[PDB]
Amino acid sequence: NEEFDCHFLDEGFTAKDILDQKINEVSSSDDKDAFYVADLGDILKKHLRWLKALPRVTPFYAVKCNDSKAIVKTLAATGTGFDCASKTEIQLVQSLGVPPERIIYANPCKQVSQIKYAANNGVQMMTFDSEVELMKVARAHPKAKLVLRIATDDSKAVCRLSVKFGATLRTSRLLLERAKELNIDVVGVSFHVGSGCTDPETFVQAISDARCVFDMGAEVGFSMYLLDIGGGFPGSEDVKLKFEEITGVINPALDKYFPSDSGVRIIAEPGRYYVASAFTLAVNIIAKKIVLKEQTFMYYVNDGVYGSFNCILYDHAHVKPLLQKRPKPDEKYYSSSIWGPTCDGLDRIVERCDLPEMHVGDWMLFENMGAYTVAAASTFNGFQRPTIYYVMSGPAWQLMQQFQN
Amino acid sequence: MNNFGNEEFDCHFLDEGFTAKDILDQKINEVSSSDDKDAFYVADLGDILKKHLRWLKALPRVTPFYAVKCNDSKAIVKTLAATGTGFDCASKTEIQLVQSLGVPPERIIYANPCKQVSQIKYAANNGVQMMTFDSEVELMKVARAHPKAKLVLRIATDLSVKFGATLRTSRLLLERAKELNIDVVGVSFHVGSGCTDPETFVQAISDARCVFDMGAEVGFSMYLLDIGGGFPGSEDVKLKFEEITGVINPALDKYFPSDSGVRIIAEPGRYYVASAFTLAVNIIAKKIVLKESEQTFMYYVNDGVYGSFNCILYDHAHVKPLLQKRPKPDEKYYSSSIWGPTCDGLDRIVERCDLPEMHVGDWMLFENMGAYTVAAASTFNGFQRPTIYYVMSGPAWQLMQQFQN
Ligand SMILES: Cc1ncc(COP(=O)(O)O)c(CNOC[C@@H]2CCNC2)c1O
C-alpha cells in the first residue's frame, strides 16, 4: 500500500529537492492536495547521532509521537525499543515482528482490560505512580516488572500545582513498601522531564532523584536495575537548547549517580527527536482575500488546526511558513494571515507574518512536521489526512541493513 | 445491548416507558461483572425527530439544511434524509456521504466560502449547483470550474473574522459576478454558534435585505435567504431556541414577506443532535491527594481531550460530569479533577468539581455530547473512538414515517 510504499532518493538529492520535483510535476494538474515527504534516512541519521551522544542509553521510541507503520518498521529494523501507551500501539509494534522484551508499557494509568492484554502478549514491563495501579496490576498482571515514575517540576509548563503523572519521593517510598506488601516486583525508576525543557540541569535533578528512589528500593528489598530518563529531546536544530547540550549535561550525571559497574540498565523514551525533522509538509493555497488597511492578505490553505496543525493547540507549536522558491530582497513583503480549510473561524495557522503576494495554486512548506502532527489529526469537515510519500536513498538502506547485522 | 454487524446502520428498539438514561443504566448493569468497560454513546434518534418537529413548529417558513460537519454519523444523516431536511456540505467527502444515502443534489448546499478548486469541480460533476462565496478570487475559481453554479453571497455579521463580506464588499462582489456572467441567487449569513444576543439576527436579516436590493440594481433575481445556524441544541442554555425564533420570525416577515417569493433556509448543526447523544465513560484510574487532612481526588477516565472532549479546546464547551445514581444529600463531597486516557498532561477534562468518593469501575455520564464531539475526535495514543449505540422508539419511528410521507 502507499503506507508501505517507499521511493528511492537518488544520490545528490534531498527531501527538499523531491518536494520541488513533485510540486513542479503537479503544476498544471489541478490536484494539489497537501502532502508529506518523509525521509527515513533522516531517522537513520538521528539514530546514529543518538548512538554517538548517549552510548549508555538504549532508546525506546515513543509510538504515540508518530504511529506511521513505515517509521516503526524502520526503527524496529534499527533495533530500538518501543514505548507503547495502549493496546493498539502494542498491536502495531508486535505486528511488525518486535518481540515483547523490546516493548515497555509506559502508561502510568492503564485500563484494566489493557493491562490484561499486555499480560496476554508477554509485555512484562509497565510503569506506575499510584497505589490503585498496584492493586490493578496485582489483580490483572501479577508477574509484571514495574517501573516507578517519579515527578519532575517544569516551570515552562502551564500547570504545576496539579501534575498528571509522577510520584513524589515521599509518595514513592510508600509505593515501594506497598509493592513489597503485595509481592510485586519493582525493577527501576522512570521520569519525564518534558518537551519544553529550557535548562538541561533539570535532567540532572531528575537523575539525582532517581538515584534516591533506587536507594529506597534497596532498603525495601528490591533489586533495582532499570533507569528510564524519558524523552523531551529536541527533534530539530531550530531550537535554542540543542540535543548535544542536553546530552553533555546528562552523561556526567549518569556517570556520577549510575556508574556502569553498578549493573544499571539505562533507557530513554525519545519521541520527537527521531521523527520531527524527517517530515516536511507541503500545502496549497486554496483561497485568497485582500484587505485594505496598505494591502494585507488572508491565505486559506488545505490543512488546518483540525488536521496536521493541531500541534498549535495541543503541543503549542510555533509554525513558520516557507516559500518553495526564495524571494529577492527588493520584492515587497505584506502582512498576511494563514487559515485552514474548515469553516470554523478558530482554524487559523498563522496570525500575522510577512509574505510576498501569493496566488491560489502556490505552495507553502513547513519543515520539522514529524512530531505530534499526523498522530493527532482528525477528519473534521470531511477533509482527509494528507498523503505521505516515504523516501530513502540506497546508502541509507545499506546503513539500515548494517544495523540488522 | 450489543451491536451486531455494522454499528452505523444498527438500530435498537426503545421500549415504551424507557428513555436513553434507562438504556444507559441497563448497559452499565450488563457489564457490571466484567473488565471490558469501554466508553460508549447512547444516541436517541427519537430526540432528533423531536427536534425536527419542534423546528417545523417554531420556524414554519425556514427549511432546515443539516450541517453535516457537526455530526457525520451515517445513522443521523439517514434519519434526517428520511425526514426530508436539506444538507449543508462543506467538502467533497460530506457530499459523497449525503449522496450515498440517496439524497438528490437539489437538497444539498455547498456552504463553504473558501473551496479548493478540485472540490468545486467535484461538486459540479455531481450536480450540486448551489454554493456560497464571499470573495472575488472565489468568483474567478467558480467561473473557471463551475460556470453554471448558483452562488449565495455570505455576508459578515456582528466565524465573522474568517468569513463574510461587508456590504461595501458585497456591492463589488455582485458587480464582479455580473461581469463574469455568474448567477447570484441569494444571500447567506452565520450569526455564530451560541450567540448571546438574538437582535444580531435582526441586524443580519436587515443586511441581507440590503444586499438583495443591491442584486436588483445589478440585474440579479435574488430569491434565496440562508440564515445559517447557531441555534442551541439543548435546554441547558440561557438563550433558548424559542426566544431566538420569536425574535427571528417578525424580522423575516418585515424584511422578507412571503408574497415576495423568497425561499428561506437555515443551516442548524448542533440544534438537531446536541442533546441526542449521552456519553458514558469509565473511571480507569484514581489518585488520592492530601492537602496540608483534606482529601482530594484525581479520576482518570477512558476518554479525553484528544477524543470526544476535544470540544473543550475547539468548541469552548463546558462539560458537567453526572453520576449514574443520584447521590444521597448527606453523602460527603470532595474536590476532584478528571483526566484523559492519554499520556499528555494537558488531557484534563475537568479541573475541579465536587464529587463523592468514587472507585475504579464506576461510570460517569455526560449529557448533550452530540455536537462537535465525535466529528473532530482522533485516535491519538492509539485510543479508539467510543462505540455508538443508536436507539429509537416505536412512536419515534411512526413520526419518522409521517415525515417521510
Ligand atoms: C511518558 C512519555 N515518554 C515519552 C514521551 C515523548 O516525549 P517527546 O518530547 O520525546 O516526544 C512522552 C510525551 N510527552 O508529551 C507529549 C505531548 C502531547 C502533545 N505534544 C506534547 C511521554 O508522556
Ligand SMILES: Cc1ncc(COP(=O)(O)O)c(CNOC[C@@H]2CCNC2)c1O
Ligand atoms: C456556515 C456554517 N453553517 C452552519 C454551522 C453550524 O453551526 P451550529 O452552531 O448550528 O452547529 C457552521 C459552524 N461552523 O463552525 C463551528 C465551529 C466548530 C467547533 N465549534 C465552532 C457554519 O460555519
